[PDB]
Structure formats: structure tokens, C-alpha cells
């Protein structure tokens, strides 16, 4: 369980983004259908009325948050792994627009899921923007908390992988456009009962063998990071 209070540029606070940049649903709860428009932009999914300006080469920050803003951020029982992907705003999420700019699993030196470091990170996580077309874009942050992922939703569906879920609408207004934006994947599609990394079971199996879900990071990904830019506490 767990939310995004906004989004930092170049480790500078853009401010509670919530139902204002960030298409927030109504609470923290997950999404599990994996075939459920849900899985786009989460429950209520609509255009919100601010759009956060970037440039290319800038780092963009998620912070997400439990109940409060800087508090447990989510239960340390949602080992699993972190993703952002990047879609054009005019597809607004639908068909194949979704390409991949992050991804972190497991760190085999820590010992730690990317769940775990985004706790110590006080919920922040980064991506540089790239070289894509100026415009407006969607920013899908993605959670996958594995701890009932032994089962999948379809077949049981109190159980299975839980999806915490963010879109946070961006405008890039600087950009050479040298790495225009490839095809993407769509979702609710891209993940199936048999994608990796939606069955698994994190008790049993160990951690350095997770793969996480498909598509691979585009060769235009220009770097991200699970790390703390910015101190909410001093505001
Ligand atoms: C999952 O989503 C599909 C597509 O919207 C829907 O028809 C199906 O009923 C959902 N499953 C459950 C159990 O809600
Ligand atoms: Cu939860």
C-alpha cells in the first residue's frame, strides 16, 4: 500500500502533485487484474489539470508515501521490483506506447529488492529524462510487491503479484529529439500469467534468480536510481 506525493527536477520539490500532476487514484489500494485498464494508470485514470515542465537530461524524482508524506513509504512484507515507463500524453496509455526507461529487481551485493532501497530512499526513486520529442508525456511508475505472488490474481484472486501504479503527466519542453521515442508495450497486455516476474515465489526461490517483467530498458534510458535527492522534512 502505498502512493506518490509528487515528483522532484534536478533535486527541487514540484510541490503535492496529488489529483494536480500525478492521476491519483482515491488510495493506496493495489491493482492485481492484469488485464484491467487499471493496469495503465491505476483507478481513475484522467487528465489532471498540471503538467510538470523538464528538459531533456533532467532527473526526475517519483516520491511515493504510505499514509503520510516521509513516513514507512510501504510494508517492508512488498519485497519486489521498480519500474518507470514513458508513453506519449496524447495515447493517454492506450496501445503499444509504453517504453521502458528503468528497471531495478534485486541487488545481489546489498542483499536488497528495490522495494527494500526505495524505503531507505524516503520513497524517492529517479529517472534522466531523454531525448525524446518535446510535448506532453506520461510518466508510469510501477511497484510490484511479490509477497502473495506464489498465486496468480486469475486463478485465485485474494492472492497474487499486487501493482502500485503512478502516472505522472510531464512536459518536456527542451530536447534535441536525437533518441525519438520507440514502440512501445501496452498495458493492461505487456504482463500475462506467464511473464516472468508476475508468478514467483520469494521464500522459496532465491532472490538473484527473480527476473523481473518484461520488455527490457530502451537503449535511450539515460539513467536512474533508487536514492534520496531531496529532504521533504525540511519544508
Ligand atoms: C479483470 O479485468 C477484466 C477486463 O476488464 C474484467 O472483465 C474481469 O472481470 C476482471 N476480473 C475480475 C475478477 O474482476
Ligand atoms: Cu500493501
Given at each position: 500500500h502505498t502512493l506518490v506525493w509528487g515528483v522532484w527536477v534536478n533535486g527541487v520539490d514540484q510541490g503535492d502533485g496529488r489529483n494536480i500532476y500525478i492521476r491519483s487514484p482515491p488510495n493506496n489500494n493495489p491493482v492485481?487484474?492484469?488485464?484491467?485498464?487499471?493496469?495503465?494508470?491505476?483507478?481513475?485514470?484522467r487528465v489532471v489539470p498540471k503538467s510538470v515542465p523538464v528538459n531533456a537530461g533532467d532527473t526526475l524524482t517519483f516520491e511515493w508515501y504510505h499514509?503520510?508524506?516521509?513516513?514507512?513509504?510501504?510494508?517492508?512484507?512488498?519485497h519486489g521490483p521498480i519500474a518507470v515507463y514513458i508513453a506519449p500524453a496524447?495515447?493517454?496509455?492506450?496501445?503499444?506506447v509504453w517504453v521502458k526507461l528503468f528497471e531495478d529487481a534485486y541487488n545481489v551485493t546489498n542483499s536488497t529488492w528495490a522495494v527494500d532501497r526505495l524505503i531507505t530512499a524516503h520513497g524517492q526513486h529517479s529517472v534522466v529524462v531523454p531525448h525524446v520529442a518535446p510535448g506532453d508525456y506520461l510518466f508510469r511508475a510501477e511497484i510490484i510487491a511479490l509477497h502473495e505472488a506464489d498465486s496468480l490474481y486469475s486463478q485465485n484472486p485474494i492472492r497474487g503479484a499486487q501493482f502500485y501504479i503512478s502516472c505522472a503527466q510531464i512536459t518536456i519542453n527542451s530536447s534535441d529529439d536525437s533518441t525519438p521515442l520507440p514502440a512501445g508495450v501496452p498495458f493492461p497486455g505487456?504482463?500475462?500469467?506467464?511473464?516472468?516476474?508476475?508468478?514467483?515465489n520469494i521464500y522459496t526461490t532465491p532472490a538473484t534468480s527473480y527476473v523481473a517483467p518484461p520488455p527490457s530498458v530502451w537503449s535511450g534510458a539515460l539513467g536512474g536510481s533508487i536514492a534520496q535527492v531531496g529532504d521533504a522534512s525540511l519544508e
Open positions: 492485481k487484474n492484469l488485464t484491467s485498464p487499471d493496469m495503465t494508470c491505476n483507478v481513475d485514470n499514509n503520510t508524506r516521509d513516513d514507512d513509504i510501504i510494508a517492508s512484507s512488498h496524447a495515447s493517454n496509455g492506450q496501445g503499444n505487456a504482463y500475462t500469467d506467464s511473464t516472468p516476474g508476475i508468478q514467483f
